[PDB]
């Protein structure tokens, strides 16, 4: 399902809830139209890979989570597994999410 992380504290809890399941994190800015506009593929895929947990993160309302990763640009997607970061990339490319998920699935 989809989980919105409004704080780094919840980010740690969500990583633990995913367990060994893949975990994608979107740092898109909700205030940025181009970034939020690309969320349908990220959010829509949640049911495409229900065996994968998708997290949505606001660099503005969830800046504590983004500051931890030192995000230098949005939208940025980060992959976590067992609470371990194994991949990250930037650029408004929704299809790229499909390949990276396939890569870490």
């Amino acid at each position: 399902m989809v989980k919105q992380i409004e704080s780094k504290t919840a980010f740690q809890e969500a990583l633990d809830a995913a367990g060994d399941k893949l975990v994608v994190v979107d740092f898109s800015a909700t205030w940025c139209g181009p970034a939020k506009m690309i969320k349908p593929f990220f959010h829509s895929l949640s049911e495409k890979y229900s065996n994968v947990i998708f997290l949505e993160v606001d660099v503005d309302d969830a800046q504590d989570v983004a500051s931890e990763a030192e995000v230098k640009a949005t939208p940025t997607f980060q992959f976590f597994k067992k609470g371990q970061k194994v991949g990250e990339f930037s650029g408004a490319n929704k299809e790229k999410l499909e390949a990276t998920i396939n890569e870490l699935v």
């Binding site: 940025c32 181009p34 970034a35 640009a73 650029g91």
Partner: peptide
């Protein structure tokens, strides 16, 4: 220097 595909943090928000 500004790419529509990317949002810059230089933004006050």
């Amino acid at each position: 220097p500004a790419t529509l595909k990317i949002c810059s943090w230089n933004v006050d928000g």
